[PDB]
């Protein structure tokens, strides 16, 4: 009745409308059009934009294009065909809009982890600098340096600039860094398939080894190019201190921001399972070791190509051995007593040891991290009953109600009630087995088996539809009070005008804190 | 019959806090004979073991025994309280499909 229950919007926009929602708050109108269409239809051409919508031909497209490129909201690729001419295809780029969904959250960790300089002018300084970085989308050093006032200390803001290069965070602008992982692999696959001067028709399987191995070493140099390079940043001419290259520009990065929050999730698991002191000693280790830790960067070869059935491991364990290599080899050598209490107690998480050197595995750590958080979700959502039965399916696997009723807890009827509450949304599935009848009819045997990626994805439905109505009715709160807000802006009177002024601001503060909260929940669920 | 399933809701209450523990079948061999109402056989060795096994209670460590960590906070992620707000919007975070 009256549809105000928001059943209208409920069914039809999974993923999708997420994107053009955020860019609408960002810009709106034309900007939401192109991206929203860039999502729905996927790969898109310049001329193709005009055809569909028909609105504002060639005036809007060229304007939106450069607008999307500065903030790099579009993945760009150009190539040609055997026939001739040229073509330029655009993709929805990475999860940039997620960075626009981040903003201050990134700047938060930027401010907090910038310690080693105690409570300094830095707070007002780089907050002005970083806000100028992300907003413009790209920053050249000299043109930015020109914005700084004269007859003052010029290297005060450059006191932390070369310190902005730091370890992680801001890196240089490089070339093709924005590029489809599938396409760059195919472009790098050239000079490989192309390589043989009619050599010899022996051992066709050697074409495999040739192309692959040569592509892997050529892939490593490309991905480690933005990762660590000291050339540009560490330049140190005389008559001064170390000063970043005035020519080469910079950009923010996924490295330590996605890492810092991942460490938080580990701390939350830590702090839960130990004291506050143990979490700190485990923390000071993570702060030094976070540089060479792939972690969030883990698959890196996954998107853009096949894995295998057979050779899947020969791919996977090839990564696992380099996930064996770098954690074992490079990381820190041997308060060690408080490490031993972090040692003797291992399960669930980490503290793997080699003779002479100890370090945390980045391979086997994730499964127990996914377990905990997920089990805490069901614990949070439903009562204590729904909790216990989840693992009851996870101890052994795929069994009937016979040994379940026995081994679980107490009562049949309530179990059946929470069984259908558990089986309500996916995640245990159901079994297809007959009893003697070969799919003929009821009374057949039943079992319950754990679900892979299905019991995950329902937390990926929690991604958008949480923030959706959250941000939307916050935006609807704007246009409703829009006549008031414009009056407030011009004023920057009456008893009742100040009332609704505090109203919206209240709702605004609480809705943004609610954005970041469940944001922190989603971030851990995006992997495995 | 009905006498069953109601006997496991009592004797397991506070014995937890008084438990490092050792041998894990001794924990029952302890629990089996106690309270003078006792308990019968190894049928209960695998009972309180594999029933309460999940969601804190006692942790599972090698050489067959039980540890304790995060239940001490619950008996006292955690601490959630003060919900809900009375009216007008927010959350739900359930069903709705999507």
XYZ file of C-alpha atoms in Angstrom:
626
model
C 0.000 0.000 0.000
C 1.239 3.462 -1.066
C 4.565 1.857 -2.103
C 6.374 4.027 0.483
C 7.922 0.795 1.812
C 10.427 1.237 -1.049
C 9.509 -2.065 -2.694
C 9.658 -0.200 -6.009
C 13.425 0.313 -5.870
C 14.141 -2.957 -4.055
C 14.205 -5.510 -6.882
C 15.850 -4.065 -9.966
C 19.317 -2.584 -9.225
C 21.996 -5.045 -7.996
C 25.535 -3.605 -8.265
C 25.025 -1.118 -11.094
C 23.040 1.776 -9.590
C 25.715 1.866 -6.858
C 28.183 3.514 -9.263
C 25.953 6.167 -10.860
C 24.653 6.942 -7.359
C 28.069 8.020 -6.088
C 29.063 9.998 -9.187
C 25.649 11.674 -9.002
C 26.551 13.047 -5.579
C 29.953 13.838 -7.074
C 28.626 15.605 -10.170
C 25.257 14.323 -11.372
C 23.303 14.598 -14.653
C 25.544 13.844 -17.662
C 28.247 12.343 -15.428
C 25.854 9.733 -14.033
C 24.559 8.986 -17.533
C 27.836 7.956 -19.192
C 29.175 5.877 -16.284
C 25.832 4.197 -15.612
C 25.692 3.250 -19.283
C 29.386 2.323 -19.238
C 28.512 -0.194 -16.527
C 25.300 -1.727 -17.909
C 26.587 -2.326 -21.445
C 30.204 -2.741 -20.348
C 32.799 -1.943 -23.021
C 31.877 1.285 -24.792
C 32.882 3.444 -27.769
C 32.773 7.241 -28.128
C 30.207 7.248 -30.945
C 28.116 4.657 -29.107
C 27.348 7.098 -26.276
C 25.486 9.413 -28.649
C 23.324 6.648 -30.121
C 21.676 5.285 -26.961
C 20.758 8.317 -24.846
C 20.519 10.791 -27.772
C 20.867 13.646 -25.270
C 23.261 16.541 -25.907
C 25.236 15.086 -28.834
C 29.005 15.762 -28.900
C 28.780 18.727 -26.512
C 28.361 16.588 -23.396
C 30.475 13.598 -24.448
C 33.663 15.591 -25.046
C 33.060 17.497 -21.810
C 32.345 14.394 -19.725
C 35.283 12.530 -21.286
C 38.036 14.850 -20.051
C 36.102 15.194 -16.787
C 36.253 11.429 -16.259
C 39.907 11.239 -17.322
C 41.300 13.809 -14.870
C 39.878 11.813 -11.962
C 40.555 8.669 -14.046
C 36.994 7.353 -13.831
C 37.396 5.599 -17.181
C 39.799 2.830 -18.171
C 41.284 3.859 -21.515
C 42.472 1.666 -24.382
C 43.171 2.322 -28.062
C 43.891 -0.057 -30.938
C 43.183 -0.665 -34.620
C 41.771 -3.260 -37.005
C 43.137 -5.064 -40.059
C 40.654 -3.120 -42.201
C 42.008 0.232 -41.045
C 41.325 3.450 -39.130
C 41.384 3.344 -35.325
C 39.201 2.634 -32.284
C 39.133 3.797 -28.661
C 37.223 1.723 -26.112
C 36.410 2.754 -22.547
C 35.865 0.517 -19.525
C 34.537 1.216 -16.053
C 37.836 1.929 -14.331
C 38.867 -0.211 -11.363
C 36.930 0.891 -8.286
C 37.845 4.565 -8.379
C 34.379 5.622 -7.320
C 35.178 3.559 -4.252
C 38.025 6.007 -3.668
C 35.460 8.791 -3.996
C 33.530 6.647 -1.529
C 36.683 6.790 0.602
C 38.122 10.322 0.600
C 38.699 11.369 4.215
C 39.049 7.732 5.279
C 42.269 7.631 3.265
C 43.255 11.049 4.608
C 42.505 9.711 8.098
C 45.202 7.029 7.930
C 47.428 9.594 6.194
C 47.229 11.886 9.228
C 47.347 9.155 11.882
C 50.318 7.231 10.474
C 52.304 10.408 9.764
C 53.501 10.290 13.371
C 57.260 10.188 14.087
C 56.582 13.907 13.956
C 54.655 14.859 17.057
C 51.558 17.081 16.850
C 53.021 19.624 14.452
C 51.915 22.262 11.914
C 51.569 19.215 9.635
C 47.895 18.791 10.583
C 46.776 21.922 8.719
C 49.532 21.591 6.112
C 49.184 18.257 4.311
C 45.423 18.288 4.881
C 45.467 21.207 2.458
C 47.938 19.404 0.202
C 46.239 15.993 0.053
C 42.794 17.539 -0.445
C 44.322 19.324 -3.433
C 45.715 16.024 -4.730
C 42.647 13.775 -4.869
C 40.325 16.586 -5.978
C 42.356 17.556 -9.048
C 43.037 13.884 -9.761
C 46.616 14.557 -10.828
C 49.286 16.843 -9.379
C 52.487 18.120 -10.956
C 55.061 19.209 -8.372
C 56.150 22.558 -9.831
C 52.686 23.889 -10.711
C 51.564 22.900 -7.218
C 54.676 24.515 -5.744
C 53.716 27.692 -7.600
C 50.435 27.760 -5.670
C 52.414 28.130 -2.441
C 52.793 31.724 -1.234
C 56.073 33.606 -1.661
C 58.425 35.268 0.872
C 57.814 32.339 3.222
C 59.375 28.946 3.856
C 59.085 27.046 0.578
C 60.438 23.766 1.913
C 58.105 23.863 4.918
C 55.478 22.264 2.683
C 58.359 20.356 1.112
C 59.439 19.355 4.614
C 56.797 16.773 4.026
C 56.705 16.214 0.274
C 59.737 13.999 -0.069
C 58.113 12.618 3.080
C 54.889 12.153 1.085
C 56.783 9.712 -1.117
C 57.609 8.038 2.186
C 57.372 4.280 1.720
C 53.831 3.711 0.478
C 51.061 6.225 -0.237
C 51.825 8.699 -3.020
C 53.795 7.371 -5.989
C 54.661 8.889 -9.387
C 52.425 9.193 -12.440
C 53.475 6.510 -14.906
C 52.262 5.897 -18.430
C 49.975 2.876 -18.776
C 49.468 2.314 -15.020
C 45.771 2.669 -15.790
C 45.077 -0.221 -18.195
C 42.893 -3.353 -18.354
C 44.784 -6.272 -16.797
C 43.422 -8.500 -19.561
C 44.541 -6.156 -22.336
C 48.049 -5.382 -21.075
C 48.647 -9.123 -20.782
C 47.584 -9.560 -24.405
C 49.689 -6.579 -25.473
C 52.620 -8.028 -23.537
C 51.782 -11.409 -25.063
C 53.031 -9.920 -28.316
C 56.768 -10.539 -28.924
C 56.042 -13.963 -27.398
C 53.596 -15.685 -29.757
C 55.355 -13.605 -32.401
C 58.724 -14.943 -31.285
C 60.167 -17.795 -33.315
C 61.976 -17.571 -36.668
C 60.522 -20.850 -37.945
C 62.614 -22.566 -35.282
C 61.532 -26.216 -35.342
C 58.284 -28.233 -35.149
C 59.347 -30.239 -32.089
C 57.594 -30.462 -28.710
C 54.581 -28.183 -29.254
C 54.325 -27.907 -25.462
C 57.542 -25.853 -25.503
C 55.596 -22.970 -27.044
C 53.740 -22.965 -23.734
C 56.933 -22.673 -21.674
C 58.400 -20.076 -24.049
C 55.479 -17.632 -24.085
C 54.483 -18.093 -20.428
C 57.866 -17.873 -18.672
C 58.917 -14.901 -20.803
C 55.579 -13.203 -20.127
C 55.879 -13.754 -16.377
C 59.281 -12.072 -16.099
C 58.018 -9.269 -18.342
C 54.917 -9.025 -16.156
C 56.963 -8.739 -12.963
C 58.990 -5.748 -14.164
C 55.794 -3.907 -15.104
C 53.894 -4.485 -11.854
C 56.936 -3.794 -9.669
C 57.627 -0.608 -11.620
C 55.114 1.499 -9.668
C 55.749 -0.567 -6.523
C 59.261 0.453 -5.478
C 61.428 2.853 -7.464
C 63.850 5.284 -5.817
C 65.023 7.092 -8.965
C 62.577 10.011 -9.154
C 61.804 10.521 -5.457
C 65.280 10.224 -3.920
C 66.969 12.752 -6.240
C 69.396 14.820 -4.165
C 71.236 17.707 -5.867
C 73.691 19.826 -3.864
C 73.006 23.141 -2.093
C 69.934 21.449 -0.590
C 68.571 18.357 1.147
C 66.879 15.392 -0.556
C 64.202 16.835 -2.837
C 61.608 15.082 -5.000
C 61.815 15.581 -8.763
C 60.227 18.948 -9.703
C 59.286 17.443 -13.077
C 57.627 14.072 -12.434
C 54.125 14.249 -10.940
C 52.542 11.984 -8.319
C 49.397 9.970 -7.519
C 47.918 8.192 -4.483
C 47.946 4.379 -4.330
C 46.226 1.214 -3.088
C 49.338 0.007 -1.255
C 49.305 1.113 2.396
C 45.728 2.368 2.635
C 44.212 -1.008 1.801
C 46.936 -2.519 3.988
C 46.369 -0.311 7.024
C 42.734 -1.333 7.342
C 43.602 -4.975 6.671
C 45.961 -4.781 9.636
C 43.088 -3.302 11.648
C 40.963 -6.367 10.904
C 43.876 -8.485 12.121
C 44.112 -6.338 15.254
C 40.381 -6.754 15.897
C 40.887 -10.516 15.760
C 44.065 -10.125 17.819
C 42.598 -7.789 20.462
C 39.673 -10.188 20.798
C 41.952 -13.178 21.351
C 44.673 -11.576 23.512
C 45.455 -8.618 25.758
C 46.039 -5.022 24.690
C 49.807 -5.334 25.126
C 50.069 -8.377 22.843
C 48.137 -6.544 20.129
C 50.622 -3.668 20.355
C 53.775 -5.792 20.139
C 52.214 -7.624 17.197
C 51.396 -4.204 15.734
C 54.909 -2.725 15.848
C 56.017 -5.749 13.837
C 53.306 -5.173 11.229
C 54.177 -1.485 10.870
C 57.764 -2.227 9.841
C 56.916 -5.245 7.685
C 53.944 -3.818 5.777
C 56.171 -2.537 2.965
C 57.147 -5.808 1.272
C 53.898 -7.549 2.259
C 51.788 -8.350 -0.817
C 48.610 -9.080 1.195
C 45.810 -7.080 -0.488
C 47.872 -7.210 -3.701
C 47.763 -11.017 -3.636
C 46.358 -12.389 -6.853
C 47.622 -9.764 -9.348
C 47.701 -12.397 -12.115
C 44.157 -13.645 -11.544
C 42.144 -11.124 -13.535
C 42.565 -11.236 -17.302
C 43.305 -14.897 -18.012
C 42.622 -18.595 -17.377
C 43.870 -20.523 -14.380
C 43.429 -24.217 -15.249
C 42.062 -27.511 -14.043
C 45.390 -29.357 -14.285
C 47.857 -26.456 -14.258
C 45.777 -24.434 -11.775
C 48.105 -25.325 -8.913
C 51.174 -25.008 -11.163
C 49.898 -21.452 -11.419
C 48.572 -21.213 -7.850
C 51.509 -22.872 -6.065
C 53.843 -20.905 -8.329
C 52.335 -17.915 -6.565
C 52.339 -19.794 -3.258
C 56.074 -20.446 -3.596
C 56.686 -16.748 -4.222
C 54.271 -16.256 -1.337
C 56.638 -18.651 0.400
C 59.711 -16.825 -0.917
C 59.291 -13.158 0.025
C 57.755 -13.728 3.468
C 60.479 -16.234 4.357
C 63.525 -14.630 2.727
C 63.394 -10.850 3.095
C 61.457 -10.079 6.265
C 62.842 -9.017 9.632
C 65.334 -10.979 11.719
C 64.887 -11.403 15.484
C 60.887 -7.849 23.900
C 61.370 -11.196 22.146
C 59.769 -12.835 25.186
C 56.424 -11.248 24.315
C 56.923 -12.678 20.839
C 57.224 -16.128 22.399
C 53.797 -15.680 23.988
C 52.713 -14.650 20.497
C 54.485 -17.828 19.394
C 53.355 -20.579 21.779
C 49.805 -19.411 21.121
C 49.260 -19.614 17.364
C 45.819 -21.006 16.513
C 43.906 -19.595 14.823
C 46.386 -17.103 13.366
C 49.992 -17.081 12.140
C 53.347 -16.970 13.918
C 55.046 -19.411 11.553
C 58.737 -19.978 12.228
C 61.862 -20.942 10.294
C 65.047 -21.858 12.129
C 66.814 -18.583 12.904
C 63.991 -16.421 11.529
C 60.273 -15.999 12.300
C 57.500 -14.509 10.160
C 53.743 -14.481 9.441
C 52.407 -16.452 6.447
C 50.297 -14.436 3.992
C 48.809 -17.598 2.496
C 47.097 -19.660 5.196
C 46.154 -16.616 7.295
C 43.116 -15.500 5.269
C 40.861 -18.579 5.761
C 40.689 -18.157 9.555
C 40.140 -14.424 9.072
C 37.162 -15.072 6.810
C 35.820 -17.624 9.288
C 35.796 -15.371 12.369
C 34.259 -12.247 10.804
C 31.600 -14.289 8.985
C 30.622 -16.242 12.101
C 30.378 -12.939 13.971
C 27.950 -11.649 11.340
C 25.444 -14.466 11.860
C 26.061 -14.036 15.585
C 25.176 -10.368 15.179
C 22.207 -10.750 12.829
C 20.332 -13.612 14.491
C 20.332 -15.091 17.995
C 22.710 -17.597 19.644
C 20.877 -20.535 18.052
C 21.701 -19.615 14.448
C 25.328 -19.334 15.529
C 25.899 -22.872 16.822
C 24.243 -24.657 13.889
C 26.448 -22.941 11.293
C 29.625 -24.764 12.328
C 27.604 -27.888 13.140
C 27.446 -28.213 9.362
C 31.136 -27.257 9.150
C 32.655 -29.849 11.524
C 31.837 -32.885 9.446
C 30.103 -32.424 6.102
C 26.836 -33.292 4.331
C 24.879 -35.379 6.851
C 21.171 -35.941 7.588
C 19.019 -34.739 10.491
C 19.569 -38.056 12.276
C 22.995 -37.322 13.748
C 22.319 -33.581 13.577
C 19.388 -33.717 16.009
C 21.522 -35.842 18.325
C 24.785 -33.925 18.127
C 23.569 -30.323 17.878
C 21.874 -29.275 21.114
C 18.379 -29.928 22.401
C 15.004 -29.602 20.698
C 13.577 -30.817 17.383
C 10.854 -28.249 16.660
C 12.948 -25.160 17.399
C 15.780 -26.627 15.329
C 13.378 -27.096 12.408
C 12.325 -23.469 12.856
C 15.894 -22.159 12.786
C 16.770 -24.742 10.133
C 14.403 -22.985 7.752
C 15.708 -19.688 9.125
C 19.235 -20.817 8.267
C 18.201 -22.341 4.942
C 16.153 -19.176 4.349
C 18.853 -17.302 2.470
C 21.180 -19.754 0.717
C 24.471 -20.659 2.391
C 23.622 -24.254 3.331
C 21.938 -25.029 -0.001
C 20.128 -28.423 0.027
C 21.021 -31.918 -1.178
C 19.778 -33.714 -4.218
C 19.768 -37.418 -3.434
C 16.869 -39.816 -3.828
C 15.802 -42.743 -1.673
C 15.617 -45.826 -3.933
C 13.270 -43.868 -6.208
C 15.721 -41.956 -8.437
C 14.284 -38.409 -8.013
C 10.708 -39.742 -7.991
C 9.323 -38.390 -4.699
C 9.475 -37.321 -1.038
C 11.026 -39.123 1.982
C 14.363 -39.164 0.158
C 17.508 -38.623 2.239
C 18.641 -35.074 3.017
C 22.033 -33.623 3.946
C 23.545 -30.162 4.569
C 26.868 -29.130 2.988
C 28.858 -25.892 3.344
C 28.727 -23.368 0.493
C 31.692 -21.729 -1.269
C 31.336 -18.122 -2.541
C 27.550 -18.346 -2.203
C 27.846 -17.823 1.550
C 30.241 -15.022 0.629
C 28.363 -13.143 -2.106
C 25.387 -12.452 0.178
C 27.793 -10.109 1.958
C 28.466 -8.534 -1.435
C 24.750 -7.803 -1.633
C 25.348 -6.033 1.666
C 27.758 -3.755 -0.194
C 25.417 -1.516 -2.182
C 21.937 -1.842 -0.679
C 23.233 -0.707 2.697
C 24.904 2.460 1.421
C 22.198 2.902 -1.247
C 19.177 3.970 0.818
C 21.668 5.406 3.284
C 23.140 7.918 0.828
C 19.926 8.308 -1.195
C 17.528 9.391 1.564
C 20.383 11.601 2.710
C 20.369 13.144 -0.761
C 16.571 13.246 -0.686
C 16.992 15.029 2.645
C 18.850 17.697 0.675
C 16.376 18.449 -2.130
C 13.544 18.426 0.421
C 15.268 21.020 2.608
C 16.956 22.598 -0.434
C 14.938 25.806 -0.047
C 16.223 26.054 3.531
C 19.842 25.197 2.729
C 20.026 27.933 0.091
C 18.709 30.392 2.673
C 21.321 29.152 5.142
C 24.148 29.553 2.626
C 23.144 33.128 1.801
C 22.953 33.928 5.515
C 26.461 32.589 6.130
C 16.231 34.518 12.182
C 12.906 32.961 13.268
C 12.414 30.214 15.912
C 11.409 27.392 13.558
C 14.026 28.020 10.872
C 16.854 27.095 13.246
C 15.011 23.920 14.247
C 15.215 22.224 10.848
C 18.786 23.509 10.541
C 19.896 21.351 13.464
C 17.653 18.528 12.227
C 19.399 17.900 8.901
C 22.886 18.400 10.386
C 22.100 15.775 13.026
C 20.890 13.295 10.402
C 23.920 14.194 8.262
C 26.509 13.435 10.951
C 24.944 10.089 11.864
C 24.453 8.906 8.280
C 28.109 9.454 7.329
C 29.356 7.590 10.397
C 26.975 4.836 9.325
C 28.548 4.894 5.872
C 32.076 4.288 7.169
C 31.002 1.685 9.741
C 29.462 -0.813 7.316
C 32.174 0.238 4.868
C 34.715 -1.329 7.219
C 32.549 -4.453 7.223
C 32.395 -4.741 3.428
C 36.134 -4.250 2.908
C 37.064 -7.529 4.611
C 34.478 -9.524 2.637
C 35.801 -8.645 -0.827
C 38.501 -11.332 -0.706
C 38.058 -15.116 -0.559
C 12.354 -39.090 25.940
C 11.450 -35.677 27.366
C 13.852 -36.289 30.259
C 16.608 -36.228 27.641
C 17.938 -32.908 26.189
C 17.007 -31.039 29.384
C 19.892 -32.464 31.423
C 22.633 -30.756 29.404
C 21.434 -27.236 30.209
C 22.632 -27.251 33.822
C 25.886 -29.016 34.766
C 27.911 -27.222 32.076
C 27.218 -23.674 33.302
C 29.971 -22.462 35.628
C 32.472 -25.332 35.438
C 33.928 -23.558 32.402
C 35.613 -20.729 34.324
C 37.426 -23.161 36.629
C 39.036 -24.870 33.633
C 44.834 -24.688 30.683
C 43.086 -28.066 30.697
C 44.601 -31.478 29.944
C 43.942 -34.675 27.927
C 40.446 -33.481 26.889
C 38.921 -36.877 27.661
C 39.974 -36.345 31.256
C 37.919 -33.148 31.245
C 34.962 -35.463 30.781
C 36.506 -38.136 33.030
C 36.414 -35.278 35.518
C 32.951 -34.082 34.454
C 31.647 -37.667 34.159
C 32.169 -38.289 37.867
C 31.017 -35.233 39.831
C 27.991 -33.686 41.599
C 27.235 -37.239 42.890
C 24.511 -37.462 40.238
C 27.589 -38.350 38.186
C 27.231 -39.271 34.493
C 27.300 -42.684 32.830
C 29.839 -43.469 30.080
C 32.170 -42.245 27.254
C 28.907 -41.550 25.393
C 29.307 -38.199 27.175
C 33.011 -37.965 26.272
C 32.074 -36.862 22.770
C 28.945 -35.055 23.960
C 29.919 -31.795 25.678
C 33.113 -31.941 23.628
C 31.537 -31.715 20.171
C 28.347 -29.861 21.166
C 29.732 -26.776 22.930
C 32.739 -27.063 20.577
C 31.928 -23.906 18.597
C 31.653 -20.138 19.224
C 34.088 -19.560 22.106
C 33.403 -21.777 25.125
C 36.814 -23.475 25.154
C 39.412 -23.142 22.382
C 40.944 -26.142 20.622
C 44.685 -26.653 21.086
C 46.898 -29.653 20.256
C 47.865 -32.693 22.360
C 44.138 -33.030 23.067
C 43.044 -30.163 25.335
C 41.136 -26.876 25.653
C 42.174 -23.207 25.859
C 40.269 -20.049 26.880
C 40.427 -16.540 25.408
C 37.474 -14.365 24.344
C 34.641 -15.777 26.453
C 35.971 -13.795 29.416
C 34.846 -10.602 27.684
C 31.378 -11.987 26.951
C 30.938 -13.230 30.523
C 31.854 -9.720 31.666
C 34.178 -7.333 18.340
C 31.921 -7.039 21.401
C 30.233 -4.583 23.784
C 27.396 -3.703 21.374
C 24.529 -1.940 23.181
C 22.019 0.993 23.210
C 20.139 0.017 20.042
C 17.706 0.739 18.496
C 16.698 4.275 17.595
C 12.981 4.860 18.062
C 11.940 6.129 14.630
C 12.227 7.527 11.135
C 14.886 5.525 9.254
C 18.159 3.618 9.081
C 19.699 0.147 8.917
C 17.570 -2.978 8.692
C 20.438 -4.562 6.766
C 18.484 -7.775 6.173
C 16.238 -9.528 3.676
C 15.343 -6.976 1.013
C 17.158 -9.435 -1.299
C 19.663 -7.656 -3.589
